[PDB]
Amino acid sequence: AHRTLLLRLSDSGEPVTSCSYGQGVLTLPSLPLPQGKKLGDMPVYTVKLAIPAGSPVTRDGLIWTNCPPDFSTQFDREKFYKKIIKTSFHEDDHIDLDIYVPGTYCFYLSFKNDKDELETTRKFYFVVLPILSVNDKFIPLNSIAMQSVVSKWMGPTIKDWEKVFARVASKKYNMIHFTPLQHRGESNSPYSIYDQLEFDPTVFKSEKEVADMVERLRTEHNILSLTDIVFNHTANNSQWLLDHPEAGYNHKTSPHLISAIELDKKLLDFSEQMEALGYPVDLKTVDDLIKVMDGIKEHVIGELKLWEFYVVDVKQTVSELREKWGNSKSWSDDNIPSKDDSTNLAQFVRDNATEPGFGSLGERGSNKINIDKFAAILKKLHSEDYNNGIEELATKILNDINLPFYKEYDDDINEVLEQLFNRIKYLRIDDHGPKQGPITKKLPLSEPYFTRFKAKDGEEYALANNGWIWDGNPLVDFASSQSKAYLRREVIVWGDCVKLRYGKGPSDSPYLWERMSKYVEMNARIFNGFRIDNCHSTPLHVGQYFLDVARRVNPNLYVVAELFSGSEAMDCLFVERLGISSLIREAMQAWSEEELSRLVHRHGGRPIGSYKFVPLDDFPYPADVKIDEEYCAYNPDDHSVKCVSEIMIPKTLTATPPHALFMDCTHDNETPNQKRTVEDTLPNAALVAFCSSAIGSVYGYDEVFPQLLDLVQEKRTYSCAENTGISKVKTLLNNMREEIASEAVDIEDSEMHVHHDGQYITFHRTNAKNGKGWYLVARTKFHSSGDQMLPRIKLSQTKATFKAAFSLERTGDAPISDEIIEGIPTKLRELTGFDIGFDENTKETSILLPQDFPQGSIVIFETQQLGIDDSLDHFIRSGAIKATEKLSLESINYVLYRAEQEEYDYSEGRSGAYDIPDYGKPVYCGLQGWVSILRKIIFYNDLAHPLSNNLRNGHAAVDYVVNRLDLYKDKEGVAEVQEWLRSRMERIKQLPSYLVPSFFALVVGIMYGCCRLRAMQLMSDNVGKSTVFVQSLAMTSIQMVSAMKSTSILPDQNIAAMAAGLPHFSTNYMRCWGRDVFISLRGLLLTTGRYEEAKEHILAFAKTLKHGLIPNLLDAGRNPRYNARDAAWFFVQAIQDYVTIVPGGVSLLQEKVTRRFPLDDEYIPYDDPKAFSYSSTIEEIIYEILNRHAGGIKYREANAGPNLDRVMKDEGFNVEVNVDWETGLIHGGSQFNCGTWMDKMGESEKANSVGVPGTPRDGAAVEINGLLKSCLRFVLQLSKDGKFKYTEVTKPDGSKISLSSWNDLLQENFERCFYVPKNKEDDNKFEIDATIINRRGIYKDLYRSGKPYEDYQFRPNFTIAMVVAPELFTPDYAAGAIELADQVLRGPVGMRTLDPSDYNYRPYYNNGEDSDDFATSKGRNYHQGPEWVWCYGYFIRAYHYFNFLTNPKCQVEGSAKKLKPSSYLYRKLYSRLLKHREWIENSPWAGLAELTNKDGEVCNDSSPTQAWSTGCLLDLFYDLWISYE
Template sequence: MPAEPVVPSDTPNLPSLSCPQLDTAVPTVPKNPGKDLFSSERSEGEELIRVYEVKLDPDGGPSKKRSYIRLPPPYTPYVLRISLEASGTPAFKNGVLKTDLPLYGGNFERDRFSERSLPTGLSKSIHVDLPISYAGTFMYWVEYDGDAPGERVTSREGYFSIDPILRVSARTPILSHDSKPLLASEGGAKILPELVNIPLDGLSILTVVSKWMGPISQWRKHFEEASDRGYTMLHWTPLQERGASNSPYSVKNQKTYDTSVFDTPVDPQSASSRMEEILRIAKEEYGLLNLTDLVLNHTASDSWLNDHPEAGYSPANTPHLTPALELDTAIIEFTSMMEEKGVPTHVSTEQDIDAIIDALGEHVKTKKLWQFYVLDVEAEKVALVDAFSSNAVIPWTGEDVSGKTEIQLAEIVRSSSLIQGIGTFASRYVAHVDGRVSAGLISAAFGDLVNDIGALARAWARVVDVLNVPLYEEWEDDTRAALGAIKCGLKYVHLEDHGLKVGKISKELPLVATYFTRVAPNCDSDPATYSLVNNGWMWDADPLVNFALPPSKAYLRREVIVWADCVKLRFGSGPADNPWLWEHMTSYTTSLAGVFDGFRLDNCHSTPLHVGIAMLDAARKLNPNLYICAELFTPSEDMDLLFVRKLGINSLIREAVHARDVEDLASMMRRFGFSKPLACTVGYIEACTIRLEELADPFATERTRPCIVTSLNGSVLHTLLYEQSHDNPSYNDKRTAEHALAIAGILAFGSCAVGSVKGFDDLYPKYVDLTKDIRSYEITGLSENSGISRAKRVLNGLRREMILGGYTEGSVRPDFNYISMARTNPVTGHGYVLVAHTAFEQRGKKRGLSNPNELVRTRAKFVCGFVIDIPSYDMHPDPEILRGLPSELIDLPEVPVEWKTHFTEPFCSFGAPEFFPPGSIMIFETQLESVDLGFEVAT
């Protein structure tokens, strides 16, 4: 008798809750790990194989909604089934399914495809089963015979992403048997020696900046603090050697770790070994996975560029940048002349800015940048005369031009594309017309002047004047745009309340940030070769368009919000275009992949897509279970999806600090923070039907085994939702310091990865500048002066247990200034409710209006609650230590729960106590009556 099937009790997206002690070495994929399972005898008590089914449209391609499928980590191999209904599809005609998933093992190669023939029977649905046993992002499509002889039809592509397998240290429960938070001294959330599989929703990520952590010998205390507060992953800003600006994101040497973090001088090889060791300690002893930034867009302006100027964009390799360099140089010249010319250098009013812009505009005019746009009238006349003199005239063969006016002739010249070099800006007067062609044209137009070369030259000059009119207008428009951008920048830097408010304009604090880094190794170096554009970003830019390449004039029009300490890297279309740079950055990427558990793609939207693809492919060959999150700003969800599919991004970073009010925050949580609303069947994937059947071995043996088939309707993009990132202002500046506690509670109850930054829990009063600040973190642990850290420990611990425990259903309810969040296990009916009193603005200490939470046929009891009290916001910054606002985290006393009877069915009710000011949270445990697990009845 075969073993009786064991139907999994969890919903389709639930991982295993634990696993045995595991080998943490970097995995390799010599063969498809699922082959042994699918081809073996079924063992006693073995769970059903999961089969996730995607149904294609009749034409063989997925619908838009089903074009992207996110699948769970393959803790146990499972199957992705691609199916079509047999009736009405042409795909049965010699059809094959092609995919870049390595069906039979081996490393993933983007240009290597496996194929499976489609069944030809028409009495049932056609399907192909793909065995899934390792992480990655893959594509597929269907090919079949068309109607014409020899024609092959290719369907739309579909993509599926398999989440990585991440393993962290198991922990003891955060709550006692009577549902009260346990202190660490009482054994709460204690790290255990075994590992558990942690899904992406279970990640609690903390950003840390190594230069504020002190020497590496002191990092253990930082690990201990992060671990005690319940985090499961550290996000390290770049650990490499920094450039002159001291920003971690201005990397001087991608292959060398910052030596300043070591207690004693070390060579690069020793630095790598010691860094790997300390990261291993964070992971194995403190339960902290390691994520770091992958910075592919730029390098520090003082890096290796003297030796490899070809790695950047310069007028020598990108000629259209030539006038942008001249404009940048003119601005630098102007800055040094401002005091001499009586131009204001102390900016306190808009009138000062107007005076600066007017004077700068006059200075720019002296550079005659219009010469990069227009044709040189005199040179055009000379070229025409030379053509006549050397009998080199090319007869005109175009439309009849006899009797045409100069305006009409100019339009014919434009429409016939006779102007060479127009819009290339490679040099002054680069735009021109071949004198042999212009001579033929003008002879045909003015036949009566054919014996008067001088008259013909003058006639051609009049045509050139007409040609130049729109080109002068273009120059004027570009100049206005550049001056306008500089004016806006001056307002932000000097006048606006949220701006930088810098001091006197000088060489140290220039008029504007320079657009070019000049790295000439000596005075004889060619400026065109060694003047390299700095990187930056643009508002509403198309992420698929490189704004350093023509036809973009972003650097000429000063539209780039530039980082003056970072040079933009020039990868070209592939390694052949810049061999050294590709080798260098690939080596940098793979070295990190061997050490870290994941990458944060810095400025993913401005990383050329083909570069990101190549680098991540190389990284995943070394570490297939890399977790990839991305800072991605695109104009649409369709564009987001393009990057996610191509790069294999697991999570897109979003920031809760941008929520403006309660409704906005609730909407954000509905959009990003729930994979499965209450009483719905939406998980990793939008599932519509589930059925049991027999699965044939995908590797074509004769074995079958029972399976559970889940039909999919598509997937939403996974989110890493930050409470506050290292780029954000503090909550004390952006909202209120009290709001931090409410945000922490609300995000803890979302179905998404959650991120924070060191200082958020501690209530840092101001944004900490990554570049300029040199102070050190204060270690406060869970002490009285640690801000909301004690509450965060409970929230992170409870959140981890809900994710691992299958609490997949959730809801969010906004109510005046309150938000209530619920999480429930759909199998057991057990759950938790969090009530948060938000503090988007200062509203005093009153409880305010709120309605009670009433849960039908549900019992509830109080778990815990916290109030953050901040007596003063006036805090003088310590010159050496980064400290949070003085505060007290107050434990709420027991909040009663009432049990009531409605006309038809009973319900429990609880509301905010009298003392529940803005910036307070409380948590209740709940149990549905229909699934009674011995829950104590509230009275």
């Protein structure tokens, strides 16, 4: 009822890897269908594709897959089906792919280019494994035990075969591999097949005779059958080779082999005359080889016209020139080099005067010159008359042309002969290959490179037989035009079989493809799968088509291949596209004990105690996600694929390595008797059988046959001697794996530890769920290497039990028979003497071996780790959602974040962050600190990481997670979260030390996700249904909003207070800053939905109003600092944002606040009874800011002096602000002030800057007035609705002005005073002093300041006014101005705080520089150059608004004709937030920096997470959401 997996896609449509399991393939789990359900009843699996929101592929995006949309629909490799991608900028799209039948499926995406073209991603393949049942008992793919049997050695009758079936069925194999059961060819080798369409007539007559015999295996022995399938060749005597000779490579189809044919028939026709002269027809003298090679040199090499295939017949060309000379002539063109350049002129002719096919081999004289054009060239270069020197000249050209062909000739023939001698030596001299035997119908001087016959069409053909190059790429067809291997004699050939010529499709061999198809589908009706020999040498598209055909016959086809391509990636590519289910691996390939342990390590499993995958902070957590509230919705009869925990984020489809079928010995490798000893037959097979994969063996391996059987020659029959050699042991091993097969399913379920010590090899096999295990001690016998004693085996917190022990002993040599194959006599002695001590205290089992443990012996212990039970798994993954129930967006801060300085605040300095030895501390004390480290550790299984080491050596990090919550046990839901953590951590500590890291990370990850989910549920829809990036931004609102003990926002209470940033702006007076609070209030609080927290922050500053201004340094409402000309207008701005957004937000206006300061502007009286003296509603609070600003404000800051600013000069504490009513805007400050957000005060005594503000922004600041217009526009429409009673405003003299008059004042004068026209002509209208300018088409940063050139500086500050009061801007001017900021002020993450073309531009900030530089010392650069992130928010918000109003290409007729942005504009916005997503992804603090140096360089003094940095990107998303969604 739940069989879905999640295949996440990247922004380029590539599948995301959840773990690094190595080079692999997207294989879905091997599981049986649900109870009593057949193919078609329901989707076998559902692949849920996750597409990232607004990514380039979502633009006109389609998903294309060759997955048939229904079970009724058949599968076509090349027929693809459309799935439309639902575009959203906030929400990802999901597209299910229901799969009904196993096989190979793939998918790509199509999208609209950035050139508005059609682009296509890569095809990405994923495989659905077959479902192998034997009757009604499902067989897991890793429990397959395959016996390979060669047919011609099982006797001549079906009944004579069922004796072998019963023999292997006793050893408890569950699958039999059949060497080809087809009519065999001339040499009787099982792989050279006479006819693909009928079986061996010696045994079978019809398909039903074999299909019933194979079915008899299924019913009598519970055994499945698969057969070899040969694609690369057929036998050299098929009666259809006569009827269809084009199916191979002949002189007609593959002309390049003509030169190779006349060399092969020049050796069968030379061996027969070799006896005549200087024969040495066979002999072992190297010195005589030369006399046979010197006969080669002359009789075959010289008599054959080899060079003629490469060279151009010069004499034939010249006689064909004089004769033709009186014809087409005059190469009327100066494309001619002189006769001086005899190298370049030659090549020039080679290009222009050549018939098609030059340089390429073909017919005897296939390289010839176009004579009409070679003559014309000569005439122009030399003379029109032939006699005038042409003969010498023409021949000299062609000669120089042949020099590379002659060099190519010599190069080839040397390899031809040098290969013949080295081969014929081995082949005949018996140096290591016995067979001196000389000329015959067989044993000639050269093996037959071709198969000669007379075809039913009459003509004689010469097809080629295939083989293999020595170290050549098996993907390169050496029988195709692109190879010279048949000519160069570089082919090791099989005269048994003849290479088949598949083309680019059936169009190139319509009989061969049609025949092989019926060949394949025939055996697919019978068997359960195929075994594909030399699958790497079979071409891809060939194997792809036929396996698709077989799968159409038998949808549960089990494909096996001994696949050895050039690499693992290529192996995976073949497995991907062909649908191979298992790769074959051989254990006999090992050269030494160490080599074997490595082989066994590869296919053994995962390491013990390995990390497990959980969704962490890289996933979206939709509030509307389904959940197993107690991990209890999986019925074992549903055979569902479980989610990791209670949050139902489906199982992730990740590349895992292709499954392996480990053979302890195949039918082509040498017997243990030959390569090692017969004693090794026991340990070898036991080690292999312990691997986490399917196993196999050739018949005779267990029966210990003495030597590998010759597939060609031998005719002897398998002995009927039952229960020989290993037979009793394979019965035990396979029976053991039949029981294990039931529970272990996925790659993380089966763990391992293999140890190599001399001739001993240790294998511990472990299920990671129940803790069941097997321990194998195997003493191998590669050689008789003396007595070696194994050290005491110790297993921590594990209990062991003796299962069985055996020794294999040779009892004399093997019998010599002529009619039957009998093995070597063996004694299978049962062993004893093993001591299993168990310390009831340390719970350490010790295992000692007895000295009677000879080489070739094994012992097996059944083991059990202590503390692990089948219920532990369900215990750790349950109860986490119920624990987070009573949490709050405030309390989640204490569980996930808390900088160490924020932690000290609650711990009186006692606690803090956990110091990880050889590493350091996590940046948060909460779970995020662990997750930021664990994510990369789980991905790479970094069991060697310092944190991994520390988690093994002690339970301190285990206890730290739980204990620290004592600091916050009283906050909402923390006590319940703490108990869940406590209850699980205690149960973890009762496990072996090596298992603690994985369960620690698993438990932390689970509780992290549930807390992250709870956050998304408590926040508003726009956040709860969005991408990871939006949610990661929103989590900063929890980082910043918490209650503290040293500070707060209210003087009488300690409540939740938004920090400016972590870690340095979090404690005491350093936490709350009015400018940072309200710039961030919209993003962190309103976009997320924390309205009740936005109100409390507004009211808390309402109490601190004085001078008609809002303080920046909020000292918890207890002596704040009032040098902030900016905060009061961001404060009233947020009030409008609050009222606009909060449902019923108008209620804020009548909220009454205790005004803990006097209505004038006296002095700090925090204890005076006049603190709580009077009340002010937000109504009058807003008006008081507006009114007193007009009426004028004059005051020196209260308590001025060093005790406030130890560097600010005496005149800087005097702050004055008034309105120039000729314009209506607001001026203030001085050259000794820092009233704006750019408030860096210099302090370098060495550089002489003590008291000098780095960026005093005096006079009319753009934002301050833009924010004022916004406020005016706000209160005007507000009074219209009867919610604001004020209209008058008193001037310093005594005049009154209506708010609408002040409003229309700014509307008329703002753009005049601030714009800088692009045309010199217009300067006379905008109060411009062209002497102090830098760039036209700009809005001034300031109006009539102190330094007038600071008026005309390109700074991002104007974007704030564009956002808050766009009515002041004419669209074209704003649009063109912000396009320059896009090209000038826009960095990758930060907004450059100053035009890089200015002289004051210094974009590197060191608050520690001591040198004499007036600009940079003590960090005055803060606001001139450095790239700030929160300004990027106001920028792109306006970049959005005005590119939507101006450029028509950024508009599209949204539904119901309302204006909505186009994908061209979305794509532009998307490209400017990538560098921010990258930042918050790869940041130890899960946030955005406050500052960046030039061009994205990390500023080591920048706060790593700041409020306005993230809150202003959230601002953008809310814009797009609240307007278009």
